[PDB]
């Protein structure tokens, strides 16, 4: 749980390209991925990816993922794409998946779900 926090000490949100920020590749757990948009997966195309990760996990780049926080610091990870890439990782029963984190705002989520957008907390 986390019924407490530090405090304000740096305008991170709306920060210009000189304030402070760290965006890089990160292994985000598969159990905390948010995907509210089903898709049609192909069993032959997943096999090709499952073969790359099993034959060479270095020639496989990360996917783009949006990093947004709720009204209570609750971090939520949204993914839109790499659908087939998720099946290969999910099929290999792996614990986490490489994904590029990109700080975003609830507005960016409205562009994708400007209708079924929930209330993050
Ligand atoms: N054996 C392989 N089979 C298919 N794609 C491969 C293979 N090895 C490398 N790749 C790369 O994996 C990437 C697959 O993910 P990408 O995000 O690019 O596109 P996508 O097919 O639209 O699907 P999703 O968003 O569902 O993963 C491709 O860009 C391709 O270049
Ligand atoms: Mg495409």
Nearest ligand to the CA atom of 37: 1
Ligand 1 atom 6, closest CA: 49
The three-state DSSP-derived secondary structure of 42-63 is CHHHHHHHHHHHHHCCCCCCCE
Question: Could you give the count of Cα atoms lying within 13 Å of 39 in the half-sphere of its Cβ?
Answer: 15
Is 47 within 8 Å of 116 (Cβ atoms)?
no
Mutate to test the pocket of ligand 1, among 60, 81, 83 (most ligand atoms within 8 A of CB): 81
Q: How far apart are CA 63 and CA 106, in angstroms?
A: 20
**Ligand 2 centroid distance, CA of 64 (Å):** 13
DSSP string of the chain, one letter each residue: --S------S--TT--TTS-----EEEEEGGGEE--S-----HHHHHHHHHHHHH-TTS---EEEEEEE-TTS-EEEEE-S-HHHHHHHHHTT-SEEEEEEEE--HHHHHHHHSSS-----
Instruction: Check if 84 has its Cβ closer than 6 Å to any atom of ligand 1.
Output: yes
Ligand 1 atom 3, closest CA: 48
Task: Report all structural domains of the chain as residue ranges with CATH numbers, in order of start.
Answer: 22-117 (3.90.1530.10)
Q: How far apart are CA 111 and CA 96, in angstroms?
A: 27
- The residues that bridge with 29 in the sheet, in sequence order, are 96
């Amino acid at each position: 749980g986390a019924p407490e926090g530090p405090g304000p000490s740096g305008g991170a949100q709306g920060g210009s390209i000189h304030s402070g920020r760290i965006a890089a590749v990160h292994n985000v757990p598969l159990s905390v991925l948010i995907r509210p948009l089903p898709s049609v997966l192909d069993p032959a195309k997943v096999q090709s990816l499952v073969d790359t990760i099993r034959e060479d996990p270095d020639s496989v780049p990360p996917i783009d993922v949006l990093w947004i926080k709720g009204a209570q610091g609750g971090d939520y990870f949204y993914s839109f794409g790499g659908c087939h890439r998720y099946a290969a990782y999910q099929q290999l029963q792996r614990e986490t998946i490489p994904a590029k984190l990109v700080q975003s705002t609830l507005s960016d989520l409205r562009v994708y779900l400007g209708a079924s957008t929930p209330d993050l907390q």
